[model samples]
Target chain A: LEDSPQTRSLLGVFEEDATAISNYMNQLYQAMHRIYDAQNELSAATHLTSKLLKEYEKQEVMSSTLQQFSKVIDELSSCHAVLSTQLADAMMFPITQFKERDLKEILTLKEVFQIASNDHDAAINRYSRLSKKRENDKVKYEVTEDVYTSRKKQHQTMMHYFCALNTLQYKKKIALLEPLLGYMQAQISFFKMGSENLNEQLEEFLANIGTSVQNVRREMDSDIETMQQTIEDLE
Target chain B: LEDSPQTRSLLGVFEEDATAISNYMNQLYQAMHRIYDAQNELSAATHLTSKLLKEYEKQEVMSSTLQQFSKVIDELSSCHAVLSTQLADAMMFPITQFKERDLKEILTLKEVFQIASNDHDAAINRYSRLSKKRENDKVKYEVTEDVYTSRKKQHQTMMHYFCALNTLQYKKKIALLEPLLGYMQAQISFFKMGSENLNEQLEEFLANIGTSVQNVRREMDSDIETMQQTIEDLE
Candidate 1:
């Protein structure tokens, strides 16, 4: 279990698994980043829109109605901003850590392990060549000692690399699930917040505004009809 | 009321009002378009994320857990798609109509009104010059007729233009409120849908997965400690 071709073979499979994990996770990271970016843009755009509405009110042109509408929309923008903050903390942060810390750690360890293995192979080759030569006992002993130290170093690095790879399997599962869970939870909270704060009032306001819009249309039509009669009388 | 300098002065103020409305609404249109575009990107990225998760499961690597996560996420993606479609219809459509149809109509009317006014001015100039001459009765009558026709055309356009501008004050309010109302309603629905379908089960599943992650961490730590002891023993 500690030092055999069997352990090495198992390590090889894990390395392959890590390779696949990295590829998949990197792609996931890119996609998730896009989601985060779009969300932030939405937040900014919403804020901008509300600000424009408020500016319309400040112009003192149609002040009362515009002011009332701007106030309601400002609340909606506030909710959107809250959603943005939550998404950053919950959804974006966790996935970024997984990509930067865990995945990167594996790549670094792989290089370290490869370097150790190469050094060990060089030592072994030196020992083998010395054995076929008419070398002094002192030189042979030193070469043998070098080979032993190099083997130990290689073995140490190999075990560390294998352990990290195995750990990644467990880490990968958590990584995959954690950010998604966070995202779903945040979305749920946002919906609840929006409903609780804005929906009922928004419905009543919409109805009143809808009626007002209809009245304006009717008045405009009536006025236009009277104007046309007068214009025809002139002709 | 139809032909007074008082009406002309009032028209001047209305034209100024129209200019302000155009400037403000154009800005609003741009901001609203950003919101729509960002929403679309969010939808695309979310769908992509779900697709990548599904692809992960399809690769036949870590199938069971990944498959389960993928299925639940696919449902969430469906909800997101619903939100996106509603946004396009309810939110984006009205704002776009106000920009393309209502605002654009005002601008077109303004140009048409200006051209009619210019034509009326040219006819007045021609008539005034004819009055300065000892022209024949036929020429005088023709010049007076041209002035009458031009004035009528200008007055017709001026009335139409004023009516359209008045209609805009009302349309602007509806345009402002409709999209905001749609956005609020859609958000409410999304929350209701998410909570009704996903929250309770998601909580339980999240708890289970959290424990699983903890167990994996504990196991990794224990294995690492053992491996360290074994390496020391070898030394």
Candidate 2:
């Protein structure tokens, strides 16, 4: 499993899988980057909203109410910022670590192993040439020494490669799980801030409006369906 | 008040205000468009995330639990879609109506008024020219007819212009209120959805994650502040 051409052939399958994993992960990163970018916008947008709400206080037209909402919303921006930071961190750090640290480590090790294997082949070629010739003791001893050194190098690289491969099995589990845990956890934080924090009237207003939204959607859906059915009947 | 030059002078202030409004509202439209656009992307991104989670199930390596979480998240995309539609409708609708229907009406009226005023001026010039030349009875009568017709046309256009200008005042209120109502309604619906819909465990999950987000922010902030203070003390 560690040495020889066996592990080298097996690595081709893993390399193919690695390419595919990174590809899907690249798309996933594309999607996640958008979410992160949008969340950052929300922080700024929410801040503008807070500023606008706060404007009601500054203007003294309908003072205090929306200003209070502004204060709570200002915190919401931070909450959003924090959540965005945490989510983005969760989203990126794991993948980046997997890509740069884990994958890169494996890639570097694979290259080194290949180089060492090539050196071993070169030594064997030289040693084989010596056996065909009428070589002296010094030359024969030097050929054997060269072979020993080359084989030792090959063995070290092989051992290094297998250790990383086994570790990858475990890392795959972690790289899979960490971002997902972050995904749900970060998502939950978003609603949680709006859910628990903020003012009373705002909460009450949201509760009432939540009912309106349900009705609106229900009517919105049925209204379309009704119009479609009416058209069919008319036809 | 309706057709006189005095009223025309009064309209300059209204016109100035209208221009300012459109300018600010153009910026407002940009902001609203971002909000609307971001909401749309949020739905798509959330949709992808749910599918990716479900994909893990298809892989069948780590099934059941996270996939159930995926189901819950799938609903979030729909919820996001609903909010996007609602917010955009409320956001852009009033501004659009103000621009296309109300503002366009004023613009058209202004153009017609300018043409009529020019026609009136040309008629007055023609009538005055008759006095400079040796004119026949027919020429004098024709010039008189032109003046009368032009005055009447100018009067009619002036009335039309002022009426539209006056209507714009009431529309300004609507343009302001409609979008503001749309804005608040969309916001309320977000929290409302959170307040009412979805299962308990999801909400519980979010609430727990929220605490972590807060702590992360707290530490992040304190970390920066502490670093600053240490530097200050060292100096």
Candidate 3:
């Protein structure tokens, strides 16, 4: 009986079925578990992006910074679409692999489990890519927006000083120009404090702007150069 | 050599080391996979919800429905927080399970695979729940908003008709009231229109109002009721 062809064939089939069943069961459990994980992760990604957008919108300054924000919003939308597709694929994978007729004819839990395992792995892979992209996009968006905001504030401050100098009366123009020059001087001082090497470059820009403003002021206050020359001789 | 105690002891040590290494490797992969998935899913969920909310806000009647919408928005936010926690946990799980010294002492591919498999399962579970809840919330929100919109439209129409009736001249009021009654009659004829089975109830209500209006007309034209009674007797 031990060496009979019929008995040997039957034993071989049994061994194969047992191994397949075990592997299939493990795979099925893993698939179900994976779907759960992907759904949760996607939910989180969506929530954070939504919150960030909401907070960003609430700020009046951010609202005007539309060009800067558009990229981040687009990246968020792209991440959303990818995650949604992954979730959908994970749900559909098992049914796509198995047919109703085959399931009815001779169904085995092991077969089902194996299909589920394959699907689970696919889902995990998709989910992993989606999450990584989302994190990278978020970090990039935040950094870009911060840089844009800082630059915008500096530009506005510069414009304000220019406007104040332009509107000043003939006599007060010089006085108002002093404050404008003082503001630029403070900025240079800050840069120099941080890096002594920046002092020469900062002084050059400041002197160029001051000379231009002084020439225009001198034209407006005719005889001002002559007065300065007389004062210089006395000193 | 086959029966030696030293040989058997060496084999036992090898088996234990293999198991430990396998567990460590599995966990490492799982942690990395989860971080990736979490980032992707959260961003997607946020984008879809925001898109839907924008569509809802564009409808004039939906403004009043904001209270209901706020609840769903809150859920979307909470889902993000849960996903963040899950991602953090998945990242930390492997590190906590395997000591740094032990990790440096001995690590193998089999152990890495085992850890990855386990962490992957946990992440899968989280993703499944997140996806299911998001879908459920979305469907419920859409259905509720649709119903509320229909009801609000009907209510607005009724108010407009009532206000128009109140301002009409005596002769114009009779003409206008005739069409208003006919409008209700048409609504009753289309039994399946609008929400619920209010056709029979609406017919009864309209008929009562019509009777009251007819009575007022008869009182203004004193001979009308007598003429109608005589005509009925002749028939």
Candidate 4:
């Protein structure tokens, strides 16, 4: 394409678009990272909770029930740990790559292109000075060669930069979509795994514990009443 | 239930058991709190991620795809919020009640009993001092009455304290079991809700996006090659 006003205008638009994409992508990256970090914390905390329950079983009271509950909760915590791993592999991994590899490449290439452009401009200025001066043919030839080589390098870098910017137009879409798909898929798998564990048998087991708790409560109430009467009689 | 050596020995045993229960309950409370707090953070972070995706839709490029993806994620976040609410109601609420109400009552009763016993001891000591002196019948009767009242108060407080300690034996079991049941039930509900949303249709939707991402990658590669050849020809 010719280096016309319209081409410059289009290049400016591409640069602005690249800037917008980078800004939005970075923001999305930050938010996704927060989700991943929080998920990991939840997983670890849930595991700690299950571990505490297991330790409570070591105490003298209701060892059998505590042990049963702890075993069940340890299973839940394992599911959470699995979810955390999936989020790291599927959700966080892709977003991080887009941020570190694709976005960073664009930035690196932009800086390289800017430096090449500056070098080309300086070469052209030196060549102009040679034209005005009463310089030897050898000197003029060398100065012209410097301008030619610098312009070629600048053009190559500009092409590479432009190509990356254009590819970003497509890359940004995948960057946005891929991680989201990964996140959704991971969540689906998590739900499926959890649902499988919490079947009808677990429900029946929980109900039995519920009845035992009620029985204990009633027994405690009667004991309290008897103690209160004994105190009154003594008084 | 005379205040004999064997009865006192049993009371001492109960006191030690209560102390151990308090220690274990407090540890369990801390761990459970961490889980609840982390779960809340995960919910908030997930919602924030979805919100960021929605904001990304307002930008210039691929508005439709971003909007669709954001809507999908927003639905997922809704499920997370539901899970948070359920955990709060079912899991956190029960455990908090046990910690604040039951555990605290035992502590308060223990303190009250200690103070009453100290007052009784003081009254007895005062009466013992009067016995060494030649006091009038009126003074002797008043001192005897004081001792009697103090003894009654101490005995009543002791019964209340004993009742609370015994109640704690039962309360601890319910406290541990109820929260675990609530936690498990809430998880079951969350999985059921999430699984419903992640049906076959959603899986198909994700698969399509996966194909689109692959297509974009292929196109990007082809474009980069063409750009490189164009730069070479220009050189």
Model 2 Cα lDDT, one tens digit per residue, A1-235: 4335665576666666665666665565666667777767767676776666454433242244445545765776777788778977887687667877877887788889899989999999999999998869999999899999988887677656655665565565556556766866676667766666644676575455445445554555555555345334422
lDDT per residue for candidate 1 within A7-100, as digits (tens), equals 6788899999999988988899899899889889988997887788778755543465566666766776776788788878887887888899
What lDDT score is found at residue A32 in candidate 3?
32
Clashing pairs in 1: none
- lDDT of each residue in B73-145, candidate 3, tens digit only: 3343344444445444543333333334233333333344345445545554545445566457675665555
lDDT of 4: 0.81
Better candidate by lDDT, 1 or 2: 1
Candidate topping lDDT: 4
Worst 10 residues of 2 chain B by lDDT: B226-235
Answer with 2 or 3, whichever has the higher DockQ: 2
Show the colliding residue pairs in model 2.
Answer: none
Of the candidates numbered 2 and 3, which has the greater lDDT value? 2
* Tens digit of per-residue lDDT, candidate 4, span B1-235: 6443454466678889989988998888788888888888888888888788777656753566667777777776787788788778877887788889988898898899899989999999999999999879998998899998998888778777876787787787788777878887778777788788778887887898899889988988898887667556655
lDDT (0-100) at residue B219 of candidate 3?
53
lDDT of 3 at A232: 41
TM match of model 2 to true structure: 0.75
Consecutive 10-residue window with the lowest summed lDDT within model 3 chain B = B167-176
What is the C-alpha lDDT profile of model 2 across B1-235, one tens digit per residue? 3235665687687777676665655555565666677667778787887787677544343456557657876777777878888887886787777777877787888889899989999999988888898869998998999998988787677666655665565565456445655766676667557545555777575565455445554555565555345334422
List iRMS (one decimal) for every candidate.
Answer: 2.9, 15.9, 45.8, 2.2
